[PDB]
């Protein structure tokens, strides 16, 4: 048991089955209609919903089967794909992700928690080409609206019954090495953007953040010390526990993605040691396990999940 991210949790995306694979093809082909492709998706999602439950998972997603990033953004007023172009004032009114959640929530039940993933608001700032004149003249203006667009977004998800929302942010990984563009400045615009975006976060709602590559050393100060997020899904390799754990908050749980979700190799004693090492820097009481990223062979997939469930079980629970 648990509340926020569970000892055995997962990023969210799941491998596309052949049903969803075949369908998405006939659609762009012209054989099936948008209003028709949804049904299959509904069947497929339902199939993966049960599987996450049969492996032991407590948090269940829709495996991002309907395809959770630029689709979410391009559905915000003032934004439209063509990357995403910001051509008007950012806003939220009626997003398609609301019914997709209601659907998921339906299939999950009351004995499990529905997890919803959307990109981080800072994902629009970067991968988005600002075209609007005002935002182009005043950056603060852009950040403000985008944050309200998110306050309203989150509220709409909450109202829909979401109690576990995750922000996928792959922007921090960029300013982690190599390189420059805007060093030592983005972490600020972003940290303030994120906190503002989730400023009006209900007490019973959990908002985790997936930092895709991974809590590097640089973006580790403002991330675990300044960011007002509940949990963090950090991914690690087999060969490296980085004292960057500036996490002083006894409620800031950080999920450790020690399970390879791409290859297949994998020692058990290594993971236990690795976690153990982490437990030294930050109490085991507030650490979680999961595979490194979201899955995206099927058999192998769920097997690694039951592996997460087994490990977290014999590790957590004292």
DSSP code string of 19-40: HHHHHHHHHHHTSS-HHHHHHH
Q: Please report the beta strands in the chain, taking only residues with DSSP state E, as ranges in sequence order.
A: 59-60, 77-81, 84-91, 113-114, 116-119, 128-130, 164-169, 206-211, 231-235, 253-259, 287-291
| Centroid of chain to Cα 204 | 18
Break positions in the chain: residue before each gap, C to N over 2.5 angstroms: 67, 82, 179, 213, 240, 265, 296
| Resolution of the experimental structure, in angstroms | 2.6
d(CA 151, CA 25): 35
Can you read off the two tokens belonging to residue 21? 């694979």
Domain containing 66 equals: 1-318
Tell how many helices (H) and how many strands (E) occur in the chain: 12, 11
Helix (H, G, I), strand (E, B) or coil at 295: coil
Whole-number Å distance between alpha carbons of 304 and 306: 6
DSSP string covering 246-283: ----TT-EEEEEEE-SSS----SHHHHHHHHHHHHHS-
Query: How many Å apart are CA 139 and CA 23, to the nearest integer?
Result: 42
What angle is formed at CA 48 by the lines to CA 47 and CA 53, rounded to 5 degrees? 105
Number of domains within the chain: 1
- What does the buried/exposed string (b/e) look like for 41-74 if buried means 16 or more CB atoms within 10 Å of the residue's CB? bbebbeebbebbbebebbbbbbbbbbebbbbbbe
Q: How many residues does the chain have?
A: 318
The CATH number covering residue 314 comes to: 3.20.20.210
């Amino acid at each position: 048991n648990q509340v926020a991210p569970f000892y055995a949790d997962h990023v969210g995306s799941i491998l596309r089955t052949k049903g969803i694979k075949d369908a998405r093809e006939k659609f762009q082909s012209g054989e099936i209609t948008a209003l028709e492709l949804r049904k299959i998706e509904n069947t497929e999602i339902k199939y993966i919903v049960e599987k996450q439950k049969e492996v032991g998972l407590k948090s269940i997603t829709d495996g991002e089967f309907r395809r959770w990033h630029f689709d979410f953004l391009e559905n915000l007023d003032g934004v439209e794909g063509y990357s995403v172009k910001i051509t008007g004032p950012i806003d939220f009114t009626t997003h398609p992700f609301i019914e997709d959640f209601i659907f998921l929530k339906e299939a999950v039940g009351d004995n499990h928690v529905a997890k919803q993933t959307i990109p981080s608001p800072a994902m629009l700032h970067y991968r988005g080409d600002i075209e609007y004149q005002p935002y182009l003249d005043d950056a603060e203006k852009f950040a403000n609206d985008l944050a309200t667009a998110y306050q309203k977004a989150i509220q709409a998800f909450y109202d829909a019954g979401c109690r576990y929302l995750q922000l996928d942010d792959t922007s921090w990984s960029y300013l982690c090495s190599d390189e420059g563009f805007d060093p030592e400045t983005l972490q600020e615009t972003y940290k303030n953007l994120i906190n503002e975006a989730i400023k009006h976060k209900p007490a019973d709602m959990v908002i985790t953040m997936h930092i895709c590559r991974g809590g590097y050393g640089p973006v580790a100060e403002t991330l675990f010390g300044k960011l007002n997020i509940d949990g963090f899904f950090l991914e690690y390799d087999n060969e490296r526990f980085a004292p960057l754990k500036y996490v002083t908050r006894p409620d800031l749980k950080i999920v450790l993605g020690l399970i390879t979700s791409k290859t297949g190799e994998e020692d058990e004693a290594a993971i236990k040691a690795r976690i153990e090492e982490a437990s030294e820097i930050v109490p085991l009481s507030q650490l979680r396990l999961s595979p490194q990223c979201g899955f995206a062979t099927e058999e192998e997939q769920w097997d690694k999940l039951r592996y997460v469930v087994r490990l977290a079980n014999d590790i957590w629970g004292e």
